[PDB]
Write a protein that binds this ligand. Sequence first.
Ligand SMILES: *[C@@H]1O[C@H](CO)[C@@H](O[C@@H]2O[C@H](CO)[C@@H](O[C@@H]3O[C@H](CO[C@H]4O[C@H](CO)[C@@H](O)[C@H](O)[C@@H]4O)[C@@H](O)[C@H](O[C@H]4O[C@H](CO)[C@@H](O)[C@H](O)[C@@H]4O[C@H]4O[C@H](CO)[C@@H](O)[C@H](O)[C@@H]4O)[C@@H]3O)[C@H](O)[C@H]2NC(C)=O)[C@H](O)[C@H]1NC(C)=O
Ligand SMILES: *[C@@H]1O[C@H](CO)[C@@H](O[C@@H]2O[C@H](CO)[C@@H](O[C@@H]3O[C@H](CO[C@H]4O[C@H](CO)[C@@H](O)[C@H](O)[C@@H]4O)[C@@H](O)[C@H](O[C@H]4O[C@H](CO)[C@@H](O)[C@H](O)[C@@H]4O[C@H]4O[C@H](CO)[C@@H](O)[C@H](O)[C@@H]4O)[C@@H]3O)[C@H](O)[C@H]2NC(C)=O)[C@H](O)[C@H]1NC(C)=O
Ligand SMILES: *[C@@H]1O[C@H](CO)[C@@H](O[C@@H]2O[C@H](CO)[C@@H](O[C@@H]3O[C@H](CO[C@H]4O[C@H](CO)[C@@H](O)[C@H](O)[C@@H]4O)[C@@H](O)[C@H](O[C@H]4O[C@H](CO)[C@@H](O)[C@H](O)[C@@H]4O[C@H]4O[C@H](CO)[C@@H](O)[C@H](O)[C@@H]4O)[C@@H]3O)[C@H](O)[C@H]2NC(C)=O)[C@H](O)[C@H]1NC(C)=O
Ligand SMILES: *[C@@H]1O[C@H](CO)[C@@H](O[C@@H]2O[C@H](CO)[C@@H](O)[C@H](O)[C@H]2NC(C)=O)[C@H](O)[C@H]1NC(C)=O
Ligand SMILES: *[C@@H]1O[C@H](CO)[C@@H](O)[C@H](O)[C@H]1NC(C)=O
Ligand SMILES: *[C@@H]1O[C@H](CO)[C@@H](O)[C@H](O)[C@H]1NC(C)=O
Ligand SMILES: *[C@@H]1O[C@H](CO)[C@@H](O)[C@H](O)[C@H]1NC(C)=O
Ligand SMILES: *[C@@H]1O[C@H](CO)[C@@H](O)[C@H](O)[C@H]1NC(C)=O
Ligand SMILES: *[C@@H]1O[C@H](CO)[C@@H](O)[C@H](O)[C@H]1NC(C)=O
Ligand SMILES: *[C@@H]1O[C@H](CO)[C@@H](O)[C@H](O)[C@H]1NC(C)=O
Ligand SMILES: *[C@@H]1O[C@H](CO)[C@@H](O)[C@H](O)[C@H]1NC(C)=O
Ligand SMILES: *[C@@H]1O[C@H](CO)[C@@H](O)[C@H](O)[C@H]1NC(C)=O
Ligand SMILES: *[C@@H]1O[C@H](CO)[C@@H](O)[C@H](O)[C@H]1NC(C)=O
Ligand SMILES: *[C@@H]1O[C@H](CO)[C@@H](O)[C@H](O)[C@H]1NC(C)=O
Lengths: 552, 552, 552
Amino acid sequence: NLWVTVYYGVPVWKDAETTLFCASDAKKHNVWATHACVPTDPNPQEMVLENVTENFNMWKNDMVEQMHTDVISLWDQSLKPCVKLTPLCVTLECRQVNEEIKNCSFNATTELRDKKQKVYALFYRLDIVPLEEERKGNSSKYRLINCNTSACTQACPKVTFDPIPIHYCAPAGYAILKCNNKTFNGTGPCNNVSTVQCTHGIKPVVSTQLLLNGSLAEGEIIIRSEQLTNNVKTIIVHLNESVEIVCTRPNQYTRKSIRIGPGQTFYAMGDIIGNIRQAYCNISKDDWIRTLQRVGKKLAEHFPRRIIQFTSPAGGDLEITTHSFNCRGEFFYCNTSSLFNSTYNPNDLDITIPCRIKQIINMWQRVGQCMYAPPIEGNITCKSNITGLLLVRDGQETEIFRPGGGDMRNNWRSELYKYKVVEIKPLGIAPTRAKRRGFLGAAGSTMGAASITLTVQARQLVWGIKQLQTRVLAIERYLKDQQLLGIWGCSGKLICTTAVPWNSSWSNKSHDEIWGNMTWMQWDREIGNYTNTIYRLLEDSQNQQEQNEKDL
Amino acid sequence: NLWVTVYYGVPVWKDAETTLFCASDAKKHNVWATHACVPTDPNPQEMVLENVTENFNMWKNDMVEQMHTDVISLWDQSLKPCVKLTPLCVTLECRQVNEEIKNCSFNATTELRDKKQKVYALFYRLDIVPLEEERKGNSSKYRLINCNTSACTQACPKVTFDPIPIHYCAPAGYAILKCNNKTFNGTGPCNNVSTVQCTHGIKPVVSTQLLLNGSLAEGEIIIRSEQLTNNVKTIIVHLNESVEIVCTRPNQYTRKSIRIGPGQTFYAMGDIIGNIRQAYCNISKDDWIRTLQRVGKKLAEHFPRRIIQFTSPAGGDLEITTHSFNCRGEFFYCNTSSLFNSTYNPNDLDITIPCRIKQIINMWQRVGQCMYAPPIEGNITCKSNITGLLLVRDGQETEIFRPGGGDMRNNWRSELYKYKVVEIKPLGIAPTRAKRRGFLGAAGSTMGAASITLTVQARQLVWGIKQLQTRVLAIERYLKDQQLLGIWGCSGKLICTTAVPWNSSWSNKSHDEIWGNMTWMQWDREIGNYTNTIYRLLEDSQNQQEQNEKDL
Amino acid sequence: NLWVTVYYGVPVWKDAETTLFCASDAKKHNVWATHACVPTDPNPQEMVLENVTENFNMWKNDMVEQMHTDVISLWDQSLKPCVKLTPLCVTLECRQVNEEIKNCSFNATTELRDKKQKVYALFYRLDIVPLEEERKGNSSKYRLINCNTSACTQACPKVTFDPIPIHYCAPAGYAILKCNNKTFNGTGPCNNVSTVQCTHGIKPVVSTQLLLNGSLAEGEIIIRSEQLTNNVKTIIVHLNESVEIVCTRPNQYTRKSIRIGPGQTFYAMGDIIGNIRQAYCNISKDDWIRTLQRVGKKLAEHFPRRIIQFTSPAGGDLEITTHSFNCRGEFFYCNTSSLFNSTYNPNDLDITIPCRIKQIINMWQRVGQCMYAPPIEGNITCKSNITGLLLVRDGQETEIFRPGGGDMRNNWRSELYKYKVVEIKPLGIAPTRAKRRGFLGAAGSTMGAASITLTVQARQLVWGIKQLQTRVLAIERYLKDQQLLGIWGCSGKLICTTAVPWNSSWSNKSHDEIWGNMTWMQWDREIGNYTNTIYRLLEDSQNQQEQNEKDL
Ligand SMILES: *[C@@H]1O[C@H](CO)[C@@H](O[C@@H]2O[C@H](CO)[C@@H](O[C@@H]3O[C@H](CO[C@H]4O[C@H](CO)[C@@H](O)[C@H](O)[C@@H]4O)[C@@H](O)[C@H](O[C@H]4O[C@H](CO)[C@@H](O)[C@H](O)[C@@H]4O[C@H]4O[C@H](CO)[C@@H](O)[C@H](O)[C@@H]4O)[C@@H]3O)[C@H](O)[C@H]2NC(C)=O)[C@H](O)[C@H]1NC(C)=O
Ligand SMILES: *[C@@H]1O[C@H](CO)[C@@H](O[C@@H]2O[C@H](CO)[C@@H](O[C@@H]3O[C@H](CO[C@H]4O[C@H](CO)[C@@H](O)[C@H](O)[C@@H]4O)[C@@H](O)[C@H](O[C@H]4O[C@H](CO)[C@@H](O)[C@H](O)[C@@H]4O[C@H]4O[C@H](CO)[C@@H](O)[C@H](O)[C@@H]4O)[C@@H]3O)[C@H](O)[C@H]2NC(C)=O)[C@H](O)[C@H]1NC(C)=O
Ligand SMILES: *[C@@H]1O[C@H](CO)[C@@H](O[C@@H]2O[C@H](CO)[C@@H](O[C@@H]3O[C@H](CO[C@H]4O[C@H](CO)[C@@H](O)[C@H](O)[C@@H]4O)[C@@H](O)[C@H](O[C@H]4O[C@H](CO)[C@@H](O)[C@H](O)[C@@H]4O[C@H]4O[C@H](CO)[C@@H](O)[C@H](O)[C@@H]4O)[C@@H]3O)[C@H](O)[C@H]2NC(C)=O)[C@H](O)[C@H]1NC(C)=O
Ligand SMILES: *[C@@H]1O[C@H](CO)[C@@H](O[C@@H]2O[C@H](CO)[C@@H](O)[C@H](O)[C@H]2NC(C)=O)[C@H](O)[C@H]1NC(C)=O
Ligand SMILES: *[C@@H]1O[C@H](CO)[C@@H](O)[C@H](O)[C@H]1NC(C)=O
Ligand SMILES: *[C@@H]1O[C@H](CO)[C@@H](O)[C@H](O)[C@H]1NC(C)=O
Ligand SMILES: *[C@@H]1O[C@H](CO)[C@@H](O)[C@H](O)[C@H]1NC(C)=O
Ligand SMILES: *[C@@H]1O[C@H](CO)[C@@H](O)[C@H](O)[C@H]1NC(C)=O
Ligand SMILES: *[C@@H]1O[C@H](CO)[C@@H](O)[C@H](O)[C@H]1NC(C)=O
Ligand SMILES: *[C@@H]1O[C@H](CO)[C@@H](O)[C@H](O)[C@H]1NC(C)=O
Ligand SMILES: *[C@@H]1O[C@H](CO)[C@@H](O)[C@H](O)[C@H]1NC(C)=O
Ligand SMILES: *[C@@H]1O[C@H](CO)[C@@H](O)[C@H](O)[C@H]1NC(C)=O
Ligand SMILES: *[C@@H]1O[C@H](CO)[C@@H](O)[C@H](O)[C@H]1NC(C)=O
Ligand SMILES: *[C@@H]1O[C@H](CO)[C@@H](O)[C@H](O)[C@H]1NC(C)=O
């Protein structure tokens, strides 16, 4: 006969949603800097879990929603304490500059409440909305964009925009499983799964249509989607080599300080030096053409018996139709229709992209939270690596794939595709003959083999309160496990054997085959439908009986 | 001889004040919605405690203060993020409408800071305060009420006013005792006491004088007060049957949108269609008369040899003198003097109540936190159940009972009268012969009988931080108990016997009569004056002696 | 042979930084009142640690930074909810009063947005900044100070300024060591060290140059600095007797209420009664002279072969050059150059100090957080005890010591100099023969003697969240210790002996000399370089071996 033995520290887990504690490398004050969390562990302590085939589904990860919330929080914290520009949203009299930039004189307010001052600032034509009628050769009345929705907050000049890497290290009681399988798409079993303390750093790079400064495949071009048949889903295309992109603003501007109230200062653009050249961005022609030909071929493999054509964005307003790019705080909206202009036939010198620049943006597709970026003095040149594309298939011989974007969460999927967060369930039950490494690096081994890591495992056991909630819940779960072990007469031990027999039914396997060829994951899956009745049978009856008999 | 035995999980408790974790049924965004707390348990798991006579005192409950704070918090969270109406509080030129409503033209501000716009809105005469002199036949200057105190926040049109039930489920380590005794007044022993996880849902209905949509007695009319002799206390009268009340605003208004600044929009009343009819509310005459005759009789039983007369409110301003009623966000102030117009003689067709409506209110009797309710388009008809009355006895043959109100906490007492919050003290001490169900559903049983639930009991062991404080304190108390048991050499067990003898004095009862006829509540009360000396005698000396002797 | 024995509750500690839980005596609403923390323990339970020589360094204490943060938090909480005075910062037309006070007429705003009102208020010449050109005999234009930086918040009239004592009681798991050695400077070993639950009360008195209402030495004058050679450090001079200082404002003013917006009211000074007398403060001449002669002598002992001369502040603006003094909310800036006017020769009737008063201050040397103090009606007389001085030595026969100040943290050092915060490390390891009071009041005793307090010790195991972080971390550390003891097979006990031998190397001392002449502090210091290898040898191997052998 066999009796029930309770094992604490079993390398078994279940899928779970939980808040993660971010981390960054040591050393700041810039936008997206992580002053809200701990320094990183210089050695992630990655360990491979052998004979483990975890089913990953990147489209359902809670890490993407967590990252979105954390990025929004950091963004708002960065803008919150500075100038709200409520003295603006006044009538402007805009004249041609000596059609993208207008002179736009206005009065606003002065530092004293009793006076006004006639001032001027240059604005882009995309920020000013006409009033009355626009006279090509004369001054016309304008208002700033979003003055009918919300006054914009001025970016605070003391900080800059820099996508510092953010490391989400699993919180205690949870572990992050990293998929290291190559040519792995967004959904399906991963045959090379490791457990890490922390993820690789994720850069919160903001862009549309093209994925910049991300990770690249070591294999081939990877097409990721929830389903390719369903035309409403976004397709993330990962390249195995990057394409260099260099974006410039080939002009010079002078920053002017207009005092609009006590303390608060408005930073205006003016005194243009030289001619006004159009902003532009260069992508090498040969690399782009080879990249799109290979993407076409891979999609053709995914879409057989079809011609694949890249045309243009479907249409809409500027923020969706164009390629949003952040160059040192200067927000570019590039016209990419000249890049996605090709057809892939299954049977068979740089490109200059014209760009427009806006000072007033509505980031994250929110309404009423607009921000005004001050002009940045300097060369304003940014070089980045194009590592992937966002394509949307239109809803017949030829399939149409258009540039997409507008929902920033998909860009973070391009980096979080290899991670899953799981909850450790260290308490397991198994029959034994008697009657009475690190992290998860034992999973996949036999039940008998996983006898040493039982003690090593479980040694782990706005933003401020979420961090406390995570720590307090980890404490509460640990204490619940210790209380349950105490109730069973097992506290103080990691392995305890009790008096309840194992009379088959729960599992029809013998002692030797269970400890021999079964893993703890398989065992828990088989016993998952019995666990609560087993616990209830072990609970109270045996410990009350033993304590009462010992007392009397 | 007998020796001291320590029992953990004893069904004993003491009165305590603590923060509760609210709950609501699944599914919103409206005012008083509970987005701040957990879904409810579909089965409260009510269990009756036999042979338990808990002394209830509803007037000292901390649940009333907790509810008041939670309601204020939800109210402020609902109004906080929308329009502050600071462009108002301007001079208005008010003319007769083509005397309760005036045309009141004003300029306010426009969405651009440099312009003003002549606009008009209809206001009730109760909201506008005259300036200069009021000319019956001409335009006169007015200001809006509270412009000398605080600008009012506009109710945000995205939410409505709906008294969703709120379930306060006792937090871990505490339990709620529900009194199920009929014809039970606010203070005194309850002979049918049950323990619940959660209370019945409490609706945060706002009203004065009359208690609407509340609970009703299953017995007779119940008169509740701290003392009837003391004339400063409010008397809550509970009926055993409800009276239907139907309140209407028999007019139609058009909502106008006046843009006063970026984003923020003021919602004005205007374009009255048809004639202006006075708002009114109907109460059936026969039910009201029978209700007051029976209330009179019951008070006469409480006030013998007296004639009981219902006259009018004593006097004061509108907010206290009238009956405040919230109909889909439209705030009614009904004149109830025609209802409380009767005399009860110990020896022996609907009523129409005229009502006035205000848009600007000072809810909860606060100063500087006024709110402006926008006009609501529609039929505006509300039917409710009158379940109780608030009466105040005046300070001689005839006693005068006047309608009262003005302190919202008393309305919540009308629902919380049956609940008490107690703290569980699971650690108990009792002598034994040796030398070395659920919740609280064992209380009242003998000490020997309550030997099984020792293991079942203790398995339980702005708004965000209060919730963390409650959870952390529950954890800290649990750990203090476990540390104390460890110090005594008892951890890992629920029942432990130690070497300290019981040499009478602490209790003069024998082993058999203690385990036979005594309950744990009685035992703890008898030992309450000794517990700390007993603990000190058990603590340290015996465990240090045993560990030192075992070591050497 | 000897084997490793684990002792929990060892009176050993390490230096640590941690948040403290403040406390105050029972009973308010005033500025610096502590509504944010617990009532004090009426008996601090001070216990002297014999044969303990703790090395104190007041200049590196984290309690000073903690106090600074707590004082700033209380200050901001006190000013935050009242009037922001944004209607001010208007042009003023200032005429001579019928040169320190000017009539300064201005319009500001009225309670209604559509009207302005011509009003006047008297202001000090130090608060108004001239515009255009100042005409001695005519009205000139002025603006209020800080209107180019930030509008000032009006002190809320409902609260006053009172330096209530604040008791920082060590949080659980930490203890405060108080140095009771007399003639003890800021840095060095203290030979009379006691452990307390709480510190003496610290009064947050705000002043510069002179330390008021502080503690005084019971020995001699004490000179405290990080280094006297380095001329950039501040020198805190503690006297063994106080000097009485009486400061007055010998005038009368009428408070005027100017309504500037809804609710918010500006409190103006006006209607001066009688002549305008200069504010002044008296220090007795004989006590001051004796005090400075003795300070000179003590510094001469510290600076031998030098003449010590007290001259004047080096120079700078008013806020640094003068002596800042807070008299019932009226902020005085006294000219102390007449006091520090003497030379100490190593070989051998009250003083009236003229003072100026400001209404607008920039407290704590912050920029953009100015506060406007309303005039206070009354006698305005304050008497205080001068207990110490802040001197700065200039960078040659004669040394120059000038009054200093400007960094409030140094004043709190004058009170916190005797306290150090340490973390308790209750888990210790020692060899034994076998193979298998209160607070810290055992430190300094032998290892064998400290066998009783092992159980007594460890019984301890914006502002809201910091308090939760402290409590949660204390819980987490306790649980980590209990988990580690459980892993070793020791939980439930305070002293446990395991099977790992002690084969010298770790310590070359015998059992008897270790338990005989060694203390736990010395033992831990000697074993500090081995502790982690010892724990790893005890951990897992022995408990896994025992559980596996017992199971099979
Ligand atoms: C994909 O990844 C690339 C590579 O990181 C990224 O391009 C890089 O962007 C960063 C900014 O995010 C650029 O950093 C700036 O570089 C210029 C030029 O540096 C020259 O000199 C240094 C000297 O060491 C050389 O090493 C370098 O190679 C160049 O020769 C600097 O002048 C910039 O300084 C500003 O930022 C500093 C950050 O602390 C400040 O300390 C400094 O004072 C400057 O601040 C000024 O501007 C702020 C606004 O930005 C303002 O707030 C301040 O008040 C002040 O006025 C900065 O170091 C980096 O050079 C880029 N590299 C390349 C190769 O392009 C892409 O942008 C990224 N893709 C996307 C989409 O983000
Ligand atoms: C004591 O208890 C009674 C009973 O609950 C209570 O009266 C009830 O009050 C609620 C509101 O609190 C009333 O609910 C409204 O009912 C009308 C009419 O509904 C008709 O059609 C439905 C169709 O299913 C029928 O079932 C029903 O019987 C009627 O024939 C609705 O039109 C109202 O809709 C508004 O609220 C919805 C809530 O989500 C919105 O989704 C909807 O869009 C409407 O919102 C509009 O108004 C909002 C302001 O309120 C505004 O913010 C929105 O933007 C939008 O403009 C609503 O469902 C219910 O009918 C009442 N029942 C009776 C019998 O009177 C008493 O008030 C209560 N006593 C006290 C003192 O509170
Ligand atoms: C070093 O330490 C000394 C000693 O503590 C300190 O001087 C003292 O300062 C306090 C204020 O911080 C002074 O307290 C005020 O005293 C006056 C006069 O009191 C007379 O009458 C009482 C009657 O019991 C006698 O005991 C006393 O001896 C005097 O004869 C009071 O009138 C003051 O009352 C105000 O504050 C009260 C506090 O609650 C209020 O309740 C009261 O209504 C008054 O408030 C008014 O002023 C407020 C602004 O301050 C305003 O907000 C209110 O609305 C209202 O208008 C108060 O009790 C104490 O007398 C001083 N003692 C001496 C000997 O000088 C030094 O200041 C300190 N050094 C430093 C640098 O701080
Ligand atoms: C050491 O510190 C203590 C605590 O401040 C000093 O206070 C008391 O001194 C008397 C002297 O007769 C002792 O009897 C008391 O026991 C001391 N208090 C306590 C709590 O122990 C003590 O004087 C200091 N001793 C020295 C030498 O500085
Ligand atoms: C990666 O996943 C794919 C999915 O089909 C699988 O074919 C491939 O063998 C996996 N890689 C490894 C190394 O097992
Ligand atoms: C994984 O499976 C292989 C199969 O041969 C086995 O040799 C190896 O020991 C297993 N290891 C673990 C950790 O499961
Ligand atoms: C024994 O087998 C029966 C068959 O259904 C099952 O219900 C019961 O739980 C089993 N008991 C144990 C201890 O395995
Ligand atoms: C309810 O309380 C009253 C108080 O006097 C008591 O008389 C009555 O018997 C109680 N009800 C029951 C069922 O015991
Ligand atoms: C109610 O109406 C009656 C009618 O005469 C009037 O006397 C009484 O003052 C009114 N009360 C209120 C509060 O309007
Ligand atoms: C309650 O008292 C009655 C008295 O007859 C007894 O029979 C019953 O068992 C008791 N039950 C409890 C739970 O105290
Ligand atoms: C024994 O009786 C004495 C009498 O007062 C009492 O003080 C003492 O605490 C008792 N001891 C025990 C162990 O009950
Ligand atoms: C206080 O510290 C000084 C430092 O030199 C020392 O000389 C003195 O003896 C100490 N006091 C006592 C009582 O030991
Ligand atoms: C302190 O040292 C003295 C030295 O004679 C000794 O007598 C005393 O017992 C010691 N006490 C403690 C608590 O260390
Ligand atoms: C025994 O001595 C060796 C000598 O270095 C040391 O490394 C080892 O840790 C010691 N072991 C124990 C148990 O003290």
